[PDB]
């Protein structure tokens, strides 16, 4: 579909595993906010957007509808389950690497379906918990998802990293290596 | 033999062309990854995309209150939200940072810019190079910035000056960065 | 100032 700009107001997800759901708005392929369903709280991704208010019950009520709709579809489909897709992983830095200068490692996990994934980081082989963050599941027009994880870091000659991905489409956890060069 | 999962998605999608001259709403109901039924504002009523959406399309097209809410959505949702985008996301300007480094290849790193429109070109002594140039796709960082890298195959002579030339809507004039052997 | 959401409706029985 031809468009200068495309928005999603919003993306509504619900799935039996968990079960679990997600509510986001997207504009030109970036996430504007998600609703924390458990906390009943809108969480904006861009500071200029924090002046706005979105009622979290919109998300919760929509997910209620989706729960019923998933029920009807499982029933109507004679229990046709989701196909596991093999995800694609890429690791890159946000800015060119200067040793000693704050950078950010970025792990793009693409072609996620169903939306259940573990993305964690390793440094020289041991897990890294501080400096980590991630987007929500972001929509694609083929109805799979992608997800981006971040790790802040000071690049250093003797310190390499891996983005580690676990998913039902993968036989074993996937490691994507990054070197400071 | 991984866990079984069933997924339902609802996407309220607005397509904008030329400001708000042309606006189009497509609400998609997806079971797993198959879109089963959609409301397209250019059609004016629900349509089954696949067999599984035929009951929903027939039911929803019979509910006048639902139909009239869908037809109003292109104004209540798409056009209303675009007015908020015009004050915020469509005002977002992040100027690209441009650096050159060798790899024989020259790499022009154009990092952290928004929005996506960008033009990057290589010059050798103020002659534009089109041979031996490799460009990454536009890279979405997920935090509302993009990056792109443009590689130049090079065999420099003494006195050669290589210029990376960057044009972006946030700039009052193109950025140029030079590199000499 | 609040962005408006599009709303889903219940699938038939």
């Amino acid at each position, epitope marked *: 579909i031809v468009a200068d700009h495309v928005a999603s107001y919003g993306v509504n997800l619900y799935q039996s595993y968990g079960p679990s759901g997600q509510y986001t708005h997207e504009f030109d392929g970036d996430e504007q906010f998600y609703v924390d369903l458990g906390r009943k709280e809108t969480v904006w991704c861009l500071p200029v957007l924090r002046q706005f*208010r979105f009622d979290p019950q919109f998300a919760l009520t929509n997910i209620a509808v989706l729960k019923h709709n998933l029920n009807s579809l499982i029933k109507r489909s004679n229990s046709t389950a989701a196909t596991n897709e093999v995800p694609e992983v890429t690791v890159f830095s946000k800015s060119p690497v200067t040793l000693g200068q704050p950078n950010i490692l970025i792990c793009l996990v693409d072609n996620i379906f169903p939306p259940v994934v573990n993305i964690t980081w390793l440094s020289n082989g041991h897990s890294v918990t501080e400096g980590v963050s991630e987007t929500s599941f972001l929509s694609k027009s083929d109805h799979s998802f992608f997800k981006i994880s971040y790790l802040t870091l000071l690049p250093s000659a003797e310190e390499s990293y891996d983005c580690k991905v676990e998913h039902w489409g993968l036989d074993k956890p996937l490691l994507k290596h990054w070197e400071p060069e | 033999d991984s866990p079984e999962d069933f997924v339902y998605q609802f996407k309220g999608m607005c397509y904008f062309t030329n400001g708000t001259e042309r606006v189009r709403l497509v609400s998609r109901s997806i079971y797993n990854r198959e879109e089963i039924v959609r409301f397209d504002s250019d059609v004016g009523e629900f349509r089954a995309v696949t067999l599984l959406g035929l009951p929903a399309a027939e039911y929803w097209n019979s509910q006048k209150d639902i139909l009239e809410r869908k037809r109003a959505a292109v104004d209540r949702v798409c056009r209303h939200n675009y007015q908020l985008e015009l004050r915020t996301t469509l005002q977002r300007r992040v100027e690209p940072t441009v650096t050159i480094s060798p790899s024989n290849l020259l790499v022009c790193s154009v990092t952290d810019f928004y929005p996506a429109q960008i033009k990057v070109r290589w010059f050798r002594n103020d002659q534009e190079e089109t041979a031996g140039v490799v460009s990454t796709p536009l890279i979405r960082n997920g935090d509302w910035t993009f990056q792109i890298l443009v590689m130049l195959e090079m065999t420099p002579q003494r006195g050669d000056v290589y210029t990376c030339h960057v044009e972006h809507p946030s700039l009052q004039s193109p950025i140029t960065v030079e590199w000499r052997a | 100032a609040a962005p408006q959401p599009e709303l889903p409706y*219940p699938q038939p029985g």
Partner: antibody
Amino acid sequence: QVQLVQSGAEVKKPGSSVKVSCKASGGTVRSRVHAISWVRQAPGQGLEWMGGIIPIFGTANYAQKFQGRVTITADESTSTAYMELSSLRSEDTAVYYCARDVQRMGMDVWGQGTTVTVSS
Amino acid sequence: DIQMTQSPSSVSTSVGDRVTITCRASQDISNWLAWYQQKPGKAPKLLIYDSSTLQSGVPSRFSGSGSGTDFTLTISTLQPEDFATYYCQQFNSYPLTFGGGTKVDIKR
């Protein structure tokens, strides 16, 4: 269209608790995704929203005035929603109403109301 | 919370008159406004939702208009069965809130 039928009139002593019920019958698929609200009306006063819950999903909503003193629950399996008010005082004497809305299209169906009288 | 202010508190009118009731919100609520009619001893009955959409079965002489903060309910040719109390209610955000009500009685 669904019908909401509430439990009968109640007389309660000051300090006790009451639990009013609301049972849904004969609805379409709309009743499986609707939101139940509880509205009270004191003698001679206006309508006052207390809180609500979606029976099929999630937790209950409450107004500040009734926070911590009212509890709203629901049971999908019996098509019944409940409102429990504790530490009753004379000011709680009122008509308590059950109502539903489908995706905020107004509260289109109401129960007949329940009278709760607080006196010793 | 969002305060709903109805004016006037009461109005007297005659059969066949046009009557206009006003509701004001303490902040912008877009079109998320509903109107109800209540007669003594009875449950409220929904007339209008989405500020201007007429609930099925409701007589055509009831209409609503407005957006943002100011809203009106108009009864175009008031009938004897229309003397009652009318309530607006905001559907913008939770907690939901009702206006104070407007009682419409017979002039004489």
